[PDB]
From a paper:
Gram-positive pili differ from those of Gram-negative bacteria by the presence of covalently linked subunits containing a conserved LPXTG motif or a variant of it. In S. pneumoniae, the genes coding for the pilus are contained in a 12 Kb pathogenicity island (the rlrA islet), consisting of seven genes of which rrgA, rrgB, and rrgC encode LPXTG-containing proteins. Only RrgB is strictly necessary for the pilus formation while the other two are ancillary proteins. Here the crystal structure of the RrgBD2–D4 backbone subunit fitted into the EM reconstruction of the S. pneumoniae pilus reveals for the first time the polymeric architecture of a Gram-positive pilus indicating a head-to-tail organization of individual backbone subunits.
A further crystal form designated RrgBD2–D3 (residues 141–592) was also derived via the construct design process. Crystals grown from these constructs belong to the monoclinic (space group C2) crystal form and diffracted to high resolution but lacked any ordered electron density outside regions defining domains D2 and D3. Because of the close packing of the molecules in this crystal form, it seems very likely that crystal growth occurred after a degradation event during the crystallization process. The first 262 residues (184–446) form a dual domain (D2 and D3) made of two β-sandwiches of approximately 100 residues present in all crystal forms. The C-terminal β-sheet of domain D3 contributes one additional strand to domain D2 completing the 4-stranded β-sheet of the β-sandwich. Domains D2 and D3 are oriented together in such a way that the six loops form a flat relatively broad surface of >5000 Å2. The helical component in domain D2, one 3–10 helix and a short 6 residue stretch (aa 283–289), is consistent with that found in the eukaryotic IgG immunoglobulin fold.
Numbering used by the authors: 187 to 448
């Protein structure tokens, strides 16, 4: 039995029945504090080595550091039950062994809820949505995967993906398989290009992109490999490290959107 996940605004996330109109961006004004929640259902009798949530958001949403709260069945986790790392554009939250004990080997489905807020800022452009992207990276083996980090192309409209490969221990290995990625508009959600990295190559470039738009390369699941998207350092460059973790593909919830008008 697979875990299930949903992401939405406060009070609206529901993995069993995601919100029917979530495709429509919710209208906000610059300065609004927007409240989010990620709800995950973990099956009875789980034995995960890793339960990790990774969240990043587009530049018009300023992640509000210090606002992350996490509960299991509506009981707040103790500090030692999880490890949270917050960065400018989002966060990563992983259960420790103490936290895993509260969701593994249970006799009924367990519900994890993570809440936080972000602020709509003056980088937002009227009529153009802002969004976020989350993964639940899990498995019976340790998992090293996480969520895509959106990036703009360089000034010439070029965006280059560089890929490396390591085994479960983090040691370099040859490419495991041909790797396909969907380049998605990170704000609006549509696929703009699909690229393929053959096993004799480590880079691929997409040309002719909008230098003012944030995009993300989303790796199509490669059996036995998890995708570790590196932090962004440079417009026009995205790096991914594939780990041979031998785990199931991650969960990737449908995403809510916000927008502002003039």
């Amino acid at each position: 039995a697979k875990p299930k996940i949903d992401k939405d605004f406060k009070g609206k996330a529901n993995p069993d029945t995601p919100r029917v109109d979530k495709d429509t961006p919710v209208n906000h004004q610059v300065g609004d504090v927007v409240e989010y929640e990620i709800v995950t259902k973990i099956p009875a009798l789980a034995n995960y080595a890793t339960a990790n949530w990774s969240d990043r958001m587009t530049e018009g949403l300023a992640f509000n550091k210090g606002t992350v709260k996490v509960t299991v069945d509506d009981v707040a986790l103790e500090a030692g039950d999880y490890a949270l790392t917050e960065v400018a554009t989002g966060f990563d939250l992983k259960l420790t062994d103490a936290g895993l004990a509260k969701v593994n080997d249970q006799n009924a489905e367990k519900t994890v809820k993570i809440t936080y807020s972000a602020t709509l800022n003056d980088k937002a452009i009227v009529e153009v949505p802002e969004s976020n992207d989350v993964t639940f990276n899990y498995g019976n083996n340790p998992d090293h995967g996480n969520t895509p980090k959106p990036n703009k192309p360089n000034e010439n409209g070029d965006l280059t993906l560089t890929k490396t490969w390591v085994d479960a221990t983090g040691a370099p290995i040859p490419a495991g398989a041909e790797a396909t990625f969907d380049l998605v508009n990170a704000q609006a959600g549509k696929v703009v290009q699909t690229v393929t990295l053959t096993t004799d190559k480590n880079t691929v470039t997409v040309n002719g992109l909008d230098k003012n738009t944030e995009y993300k390369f989303v790796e199509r699941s490669i059996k036995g490999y998890s995708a570790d998207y590196q932090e962004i350092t440079t417009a026009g460059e995205i790096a991914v490290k594939n780990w041979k973790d031998e785990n199931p593909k991650p969960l990737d919830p449908t995403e809510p959107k916000v927008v502002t008008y003039g």
